[PDB]
């Protein structure tokens, strides 16, 4: 009541080492680390494959 508490319970689904994706888990980010919202262009490199085996479902 004195302040406003907005909390999100969120689940990891991977990691970006650098300029690339690496599916995995068991990675614990240290507290106070900043949290951003992902852009759609980054999400497009995920759910995508090589052009020789791309099948657009929707």
């Amino acid at each position: 009541k004195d302040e406003d508490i907005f909390i999100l319970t969120v689940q990891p689904v991977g990691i970006f080492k650098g300029e690339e994706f690496f599916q995995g888990n068991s990675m614990l980010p240290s507290p106070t680390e900043p949290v951003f919202l992902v852009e759609d262009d980054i999400l497009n490199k995920i759910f995508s494959n090589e052009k020789t085996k791309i099948f657009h479902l929707g």
Partner: protein, 59 residues
């Protein structure tokens, strides 16, 4: 008489329990079926039940 079995299956719940329950050593890889983890957890030794929660996490 000198025979051994290596039961290799991706669906442990579908294999007959008469053959799997006679296995002493387990080499468990990643399992994603909740009906498969439950069956293999009850077949592992009791000391490894605490560490048997890594099966969906192994990569």
């Amino acid at each position: 008489y000198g025979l051994s079995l290596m039961v290799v299956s991706q669906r442990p719940s579908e294999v007959s329990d008469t053959i799997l329950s006679q296995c002493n050593n387990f080499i468990n890889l990643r399992l994603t079926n909740i009906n498969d983890q439950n069956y293999i957890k009850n077949l592992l030794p009791d000391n490894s039940r605490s560490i048997s929660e890594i099966l969906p996490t192994l990569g």
